[PDB]
Symmetry: C3
Subunit: 102 residues, 3 copies
C-alpha cells in the first residue's frame, strides 16, 4: 500500500572543512536529516556561473544529500550563496520520489 511523495533532492558538494557550516545551515532551515558521502575529489567548474571558484586536485570533497520539500529549496540556495562567493562548491537540485505506506 505504497504512495509516492515528490521531494527535491539536493547534492551539496564542497570541501570537508566546511561540513559543520553546511550542516548547521540545513538544521537552522528545518531540514529533517541528511546523509554524507565522503572521499570525493574534483576538478574545475561544476555547472556554476563563470568565475565561480573551481575545485582542484588537492580538495578533499564531500557530498551532502538532503531530501527536501520544494518550498525549502529557494531559501537554502540563498543561504549557501554567500558561502559560494568565497568557496568552491555546487548544489545539484533533482526531482525524486519517496514511497510511504498508506
Amino acid at each position: 500500500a505504497i504512495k509516492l511523495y515528490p521531494l527535491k533532492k539536493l547534492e551539496i558538494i564542497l570541501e570537508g572543512a566546511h561540513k559543520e557550516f553546511a550542516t548547521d545551515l540545513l538544521d537552522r532551515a528545518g531540514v529533517k536529516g541528511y546523509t554524507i558521502v565522503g572521499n570525493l575529489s574534483g576538478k574545475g567548474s561544476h555547472g556554476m556561473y563563470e568565475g565561480h571558484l573551481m575545485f582542484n586536485e588537492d580538495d578533499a570533497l564531500i557530498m551532502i544529500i538532503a531530501a527536501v520539500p520544494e518550498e525549502l529549496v529557494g531559501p537554502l540556495l540563498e543561504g549557501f550563496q554567500p558561502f559560494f562567493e568565497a568557496h568552491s562548491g555546487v548544489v545539484f537540485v533533482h526531482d525524486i520520489q519517496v514511497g510511504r505506506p498508506i
Copy 2:
C-alpha cells in the same frame, strides 16, 4: 547511433550490516545488477513518514544503486517496507536515461 532508454534509478541508503539482505531482495525481484557506494554517514529523517527510524552518527551507511524498469519499482518498495518498519533507511526514486547503440 545512440538512442536513450528511460529507466528508474533507485538510491537505497541503509546500514552496511544489511547489505546482503537488500541485495538478495534485488536479486529475487529480478534486478539485473547494482552498484554500491560505501562510507556514508547520516543523521535524522531523510524524507520518510514521521516516526520512521532516523539515522544517527554511529551508523555506517551504504548506498545501493539499481537502475530498473518502471514496472519493477512498486514491487521493490513493497519488498523493502517490512524492513524499513524496523530499520533506518530510505529509497530515492529518480528518472534517468541510459544510452544504447541502435
Copy 3:
C-alpha cells in the same frame, strides 16, 4: 536573487584503472569540470543492452559526475561507446538544476 539553470547530470561508473581515459574524454569535449566518487563496487548489468560487459565483485569502481549542457550529452555518449564495447560500465543521464545569482 537566484535563478535556476537546467543542465544534464552524468553519472559515469567504470573501473578506476580507466579514470584518466574518461577524464581526458570529458576535457577534450569541453566539459568544464567533474567530481569523482571513489570506492564503489558492483555486480551485474546496470541498465545497458543485453550482452554489455557486467561488473563483478573484484572491480574497484569509481563514479565520475559531470554537469553538462544538454547539447554535450549526445557527443559524450558517442565518445564513450567504443570504450563500453570492451569494458564494463554505464552512464546515467539525469535532469538537474543549478542555482545562479541574477
